[PDB]
């Protein structure tokens, strides 16, 4: 067993064009500053990243040791400085792996290059799978039993600002706006024609309603928005078993697609007038209850 | 963009990676709020924080695109180039 494991590492060193000469480091690179920058916080404060401090200290130790050995000091101090440089690089690459992790202002440990990647709050499971998006509103849900199964009610403010670009297209097309900045001005000021165009644009626009804990596939669906008054989003009363969206004051998120291809997919596969069937055991889900 | 492969690297590889080095162990000036030489956040080694501009006085004009300043050693490049340039310490 001790033979084979060692022998697989040796096997990894057999064919690979690598060289373990680099397995012991004569240098250390540094990340660019914009990925670990400092900022001028109010009151003369400078909020700095911890990796900045770690690089600062290791550079300090490097300079001190190089200047000490520039003249040939006795070997005990030189060896102590060498081991301190080794320990500083060890803390840099992983502060918590070996020894007491190096702290900063408070007692909390700093963060190394092998902590900004791993873990839940690193990069993988925090920034690449799910990226917070534009054109993504949210508001409170209220039941309305005056809707077709493919319908939802949306307040006029979220509708004004979400569909603001399509609204602007139509005001410019209708020649109400002589220029685009005038279109901005009438969007901000608000007119009767603005709400008329908003009621016009909400038509033929599937809208992806969504809830937070998407436990199953039938948790995000499409609807057709109708410009209801008030300040709450309005929902059909037999899709509240798919979303599990009951009215204890809950809140619902709403998204919008941008590509017409996305619109076709959302009106074909997503639209809740076709997805009557649950995906688990076949039975219909959107039925009277 | 068909395959992703990894391995190890040496000093030749890192100097291929990087642009310069760093020896001054501290950040930019706290008096004039300006960068320094051979330190962290240095415009010589990392990208210039101010775009179409350099460190001293000579290439602040807009008609300079990507050229190198004669004294502060800063290529007049993007602010986002401060996100890509890299350096190293040599122990």
């Amino acid at each position: 067993t001790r033979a084979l494991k060692r022998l697989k590492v040796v096997s990894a060193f057999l064919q690979t064009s690598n060289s373990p000469k680099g397995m012991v480091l004569d240098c250390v690179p540094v990340i660019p500053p914009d990925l670990r920058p400092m900022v001028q916080l109010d009151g003369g404060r400078f909020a700095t990243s911890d990796l900045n401090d770690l690089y600062r200290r290791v550079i300090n130790r490097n300079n001190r040791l190089k200047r000490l050995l520039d003249l040939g000091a006795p070997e005990i101090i030189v060896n102590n400085e060498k081991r301190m440089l080794q320990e500083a690089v060890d803390a840099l690459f992983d502060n918590g792996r070996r020894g007491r992790p190096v702290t900063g202002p408070g007692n909390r440990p700093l963060k190394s290059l092998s902590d900004m990647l791993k873990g839940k709050q690193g990069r993988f499971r925090q920034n690449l799978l799910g990226k917070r998006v534009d054109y993504s509103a949210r508001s409170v849900i209220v039941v309305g039993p005056q809707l077709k199964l493919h319908q939802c009610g949306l307040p006029k403010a979220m509708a004004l600002e979400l569909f603001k670009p399509f609204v602007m297209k139509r005001l410019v097309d209708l020649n109400h706006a002589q220029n685009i900045k005038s279109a901005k001005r009438m969007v901000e000021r608000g007119r009767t024609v603005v709400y008329d165009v908003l009621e016009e644009v909400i038509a033929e626009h599937p809208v992806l309603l969504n809830r937070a804990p998407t436990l199953h596939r039938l948790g995000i669906q499409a609807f057709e928005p109708q410009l209801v008054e008030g300040k709450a989003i309005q929902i059909h009363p037999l899709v509240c078993t798919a979303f599990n969206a009951d009215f204890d004051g809950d809140q619902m998120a709403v998204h919008l697609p941008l590509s017409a291809e996305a619109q076709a997919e959302a009106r074909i596969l997503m639209l809740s007038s076709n997805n009557i069937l649950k995906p688990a055991d076949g039975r219909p889900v959107t039925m009277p209850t | 963009f068909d395959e992703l492969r990894i391995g190890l690297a040496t000093a030749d590889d890192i100097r291929q990676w990087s642009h310069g080095e760093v020896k001054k162990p501290e950040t930019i000036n706290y008096r004039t709020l300006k960068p320094e030489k051979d330190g962290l956040f240095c415009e010589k080694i990392f990208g210039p924080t101010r775009d179409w501009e350099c460190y001293c006085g000579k290439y602040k004009r807009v008609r300079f695109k990507g050229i190198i300043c004669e004294r502060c050693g800063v290529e007049v490049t993007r602010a986002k180039v401060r996100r890509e340039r890299m350096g190293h310490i040599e122990l």
């Binding site: 920058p37 400092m38 916080l41 400078f46 909020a47 990243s49 202002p105 | 950040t27 008096r31």
Partner: peptide, 26 residues
Amino acid sequence: QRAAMRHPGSTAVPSDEMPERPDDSL
């Protein structure tokens, strides 16, 4: 003491640096 406490604006705060810094690029 004179290196740090003189203009001691250098604070290594991670919890109030990534959310508190706006982006110039629109």
